[PDB]
Symmetry: D2
Amino acid sequence: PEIITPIITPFTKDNRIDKEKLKIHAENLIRKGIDKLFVNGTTGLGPSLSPEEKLENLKAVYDVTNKIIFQVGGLNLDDAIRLAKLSKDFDIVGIASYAPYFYPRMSEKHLVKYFKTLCEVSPHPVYLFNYPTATGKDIDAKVAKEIGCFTGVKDTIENIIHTLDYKRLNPNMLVYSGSDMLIATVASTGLDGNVAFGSNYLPEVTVTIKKLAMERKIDEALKLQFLHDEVIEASRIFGSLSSNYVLTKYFQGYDLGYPRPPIFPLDDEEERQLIKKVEGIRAKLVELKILKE
Amino acid sequence: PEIITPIITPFTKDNRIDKEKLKIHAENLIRKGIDKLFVNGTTGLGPSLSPEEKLENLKAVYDVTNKIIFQVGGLNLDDAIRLAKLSKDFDIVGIASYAPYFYPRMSEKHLVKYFKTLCEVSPHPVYLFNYPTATGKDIDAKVAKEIGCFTGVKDTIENIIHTLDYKRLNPNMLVYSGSDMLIATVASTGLDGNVAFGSNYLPEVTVTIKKLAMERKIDEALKLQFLHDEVIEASRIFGSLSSNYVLTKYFQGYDLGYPRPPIFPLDDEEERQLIKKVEGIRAKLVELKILKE
Amino acid sequence: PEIITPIITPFTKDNRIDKEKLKIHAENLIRKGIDKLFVNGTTGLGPSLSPEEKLENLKAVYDVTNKIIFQVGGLNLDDAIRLAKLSKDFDIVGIASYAPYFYPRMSEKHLVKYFKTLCEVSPHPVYLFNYPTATGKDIDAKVAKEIGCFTGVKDTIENIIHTLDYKRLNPNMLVYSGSDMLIATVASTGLDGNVAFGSNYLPEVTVTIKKLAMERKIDEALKLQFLHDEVIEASRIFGSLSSNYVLTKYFQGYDLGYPRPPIFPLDDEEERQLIKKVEGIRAKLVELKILKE
Amino acid sequence: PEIITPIITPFTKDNRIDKEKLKIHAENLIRKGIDKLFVNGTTGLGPSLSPEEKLENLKAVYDVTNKIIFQVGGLNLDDAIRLAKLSKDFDIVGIASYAPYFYPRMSEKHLVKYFKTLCEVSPHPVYLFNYPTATGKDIDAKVAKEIGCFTGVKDTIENIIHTLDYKRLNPNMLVYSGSDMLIATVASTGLDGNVAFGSNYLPEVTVTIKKLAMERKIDEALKLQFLHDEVIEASRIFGSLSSNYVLTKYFQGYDLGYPRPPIFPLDDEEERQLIKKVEGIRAKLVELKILKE
């Protein structure tokens, strides 16, 4: 199984993408063993980026690595189509889209039509990003089968039965979980890995959990998994999408600038208090030699 | 109380705003007794619109009426701020924003700061659009009080207890419902009216329900409310946001063009089945002398 | 419209029904204008009573008043049937049942069969008690129509659209709300009243809200309604089912003994603090002359 | 890890416990490799049983095996206390209770006191049965830690993160899942097993899945898990609790009598359609040599 980082988009003080900070972040991720980078995902504030900014992010990351899944979705199908076609000139793993968000009570026929349109135009394999809490819709294993063109799915949901059903109904589909708390479990139960937002700031931890689980050291994997779980809880105190910036600077030693408001940056006191919550976890990760200080 | 139309955005075949069809629609709604027009709402596919397109919608409706609430929100606060400021040169009722959508687990502090920022820059009264199913967040009466700068709220939620609580904690706030099935109830329980998506296609019905309720003819207001409920139920079969285009053409006699995919238009057969579902209702309404012909 | 009290079941220190305290409570309720008493409902800890205790409660209340709706439901259909038949010798308003609780994923056919069986044996009109949160199932207006034998329904749900749909599909059915916060709204919108748990301790308030609303004094009704809303919030601090005992003693001047554990009685400090929360509301109700001290 | 059967309660035509059919069933389950029997659970219609009937179920299964967890909970704490104490004279694995059901908005303090009371009186280890959908309350890992006296937990919930959290906060607690679709996953991620309702009718399947998973043959455990998933899906068509009677007769060859209404038995046609839905699965299982014949 794989660990895929939904990579953070660093912004400047003037609310532009800070490409050089992004390249440094992507470079470190790959060096630490991340298999692939999911660009323009939730953690990257994809929904807050213009089409032109989504392309900007692809080009920056591609200067570091071609192991990219390129998220192109949005509420303007013409823009999503254009981004899909633009990717033909890149040697990337695939494109991806979440379901059309905001609008509830969308018909299944229209949801299927949206994804089938993206498949019809894609020059690359297509990954379903299923995130029912964020988008308001579930593209479950039956619907994914009906759509019929997905190479893989990322299932972000509080229900691993739902995730397993993709393998059950689509046995040749790649199936990933979006739950950082399930890295050990996903690996142990025959699924294909995790798209882990916490791998932005603790890539060492996420790959080691998975490796321990694949070495049949489940107890050791769960011990490390439970420590990762505690860092995730701390990031939720002040909002995980904002806190991800602070935690990456803290654990990896370079800064990712700013989020894009309304994803507001933590102030200096929130940062202080967040670091207080994870300081001891860092110390234990250093002792275990997962972190080189 | 008032009926406010979240006005549909007509699109061209090549996915541009059809300003001419939009003026025709706005003129009819005002002519038929609609009090104000809510622009770039859900029914107008506001989240599908770029900032420039949101302002293009304002300019077109502004050629018809000053009775406009201008929705400006989105996931780029700089863009929403820019639209709020640009509205100074329009003599309109107010601006409005739904909560930041898509992202779950946003802190209350960040949500409050988002709305307060818009208030600080607004040259007009500010209206909260609360729509928890669509945005994933609830800005309830307590948080609205905390934010402290709203002139009104539109509460799109089936729980009218929630809606009444805005009046109980903010007695000077205008309080509207977004649930078309509650026009008679809202008007009769002391609230300030409905932003009614079905007033796009049956403004005569929505206005007459409000009138009967104001006269305390509640039994007669319910009979018409219950017929209106049946048209909403029919609109959902193929998807409400797409079906509203078809229903406005059927009942009001003019074309509103296309929606913006992934809000796909109904096909000719879907149109036929929908008309068949409501043509009896139209007869019942002609008989009742609410609709001509 | 009517105010119906789901009457509290007082228990002794030895976990038996205190019949004499119940008779005093029922007597006061009727004297203060409550139209009818719903016996063995949620507020009466019906689900915690044996069949024999449910009958006990009927006989005690019937010594005071025949205006009784007798709740008989449970997970042993044979017992529910026996209680239904036993009521033939009483001149009561009707029997009632909530849907079979605990078990999820019950088929609609089995739910319909359960209620139709109770109708087949009832010597009195039958009321549907719909409480989806408590039972896990919704017996909505379509299902109630399918069942076809309900004289009335009590809808306890956070959604007045749902409640109105019973009138829309069953125009000759009595339709009540179980939301104490909606007394004014229910009366104003053409529904038949409220089964109000707060009428146990403030029957004066509940009947006056309804009366003001029917006198077309909606503002005055809402003012009193919002004060009742504040008492309900206070009862939730420590658990409303337990707090109902303390609040009835406080406002009505007689005690109702104890609840049945696990509905634990508040201790003396919780009681102190609860009274602190409503002390000022009592003072304002005295000033308004709704309460005679 | 272990497979534990929440054993079905067979009823007679006249609605009494059929002790003879219950012993036959318990004997077969032990014979086929089931580790322990959970008595008066959901699958056994425990909430439909009186206290005397819960004890009658214990005595009957106790004639067969000592490997019993005895569920004793209910809405009369005196009755649950009495059953806990009566269990002293049985050499069994432990007692158990689901949370107080039906009543919403029970305070955490009252829920904690309920479980602590049972612990104080118990002559055996105490197991928490957590089933939020059925009871309306969640007793999560933190509250279980607060209660502090549980030897194990059965977590009936699709979110395995929730289940894992019991191990993370209570490392010495036995942690079981109640989701049959997760037997392979649970066994492979370091948890202590499943209380599997489908082990009533396919104990051979449930035991073999656990075995394959323990051998780290996860792919082969998933294939059998996915066939087991199909039988559960078929059981839901007409209602799982009723259908389990029919499925145990089909697969294990002996009659388990009737359920207790409103858990109504399937009718002869419903039985035929269910068998038709699973007879292919039976062939696939015979072919795989998991079932004889």
